[PDB]
């Protein structure tokens, strides 16, 4: 899809893993997912909530399979999932963030979308 950024990687991963039904949005669905053996990617953002969850997500991914890719601006990845699909990007109806998203087995069967991990396994 994109030019293999630290950001366009999610931009091609999302718009795609929703059809896999992978995007366990919110923090609670995320925790419920990665507490099991399903998680294959995690995200975060700034601390618009209690400062004790940025401890917990880092700690839980660390326990079994850490893959945290911290990309700030919660509202950005929020705009990348919305509720579902689109109305506008200038959408005053429902545009809020996610602050964490957990993909399952890197989504539907795919080609260049895998290259995110082909890049960021070794540099980290």
């Amino acid at each position: 899809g994109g030019v293999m950024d630290v950001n366009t990687a999610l931009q091609e991963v999302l718009k795609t893993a929703l059809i896999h039904d992978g995007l366990a949005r919110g923090i609670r669905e995320a925790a419920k997912a990665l507490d099991k053996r399903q998680a294959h990617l995690c995200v975060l953002a700034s601390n618009c909530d209690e400062p004790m969850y940025v401890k917990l997500v880092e700690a839980l991914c660390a326990e079994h399979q850490i893959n945290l890719i911290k990309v700030d601006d919660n509202k950005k990845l929020g705009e990348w999932v919305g509720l579902c699909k689109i109305d506008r990007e200038g959408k005053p109806r429902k545009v809020v963030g996610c602050s964490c998203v957990v993909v399952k087995d890197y989504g539907k069967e795919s080609q260049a979308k895998d290259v995110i991990e082909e890049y960021f396994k070794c540099k980290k």
């Binding site: 923090i27 609670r28 925790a31 099991k36 004790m52 969850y53 401890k55 917990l56 880092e58 700690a59 839980l60 660390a62 326990e63």
Partner: peptide
């Protein structure tokens, strides 16, 4: 929302309430 876990250290989790040993439950 969610405060069911506590850390002794980052990557050393503790759980206040036990997870249910159920088959239908994941």
């Amino acid at each position: 929302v969610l405060k069911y876990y506590k850390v002794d250290e980052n990557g050393k989790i503790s759980r206040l309430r036990r997870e249910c040993p159920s088959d239908e439950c994941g």
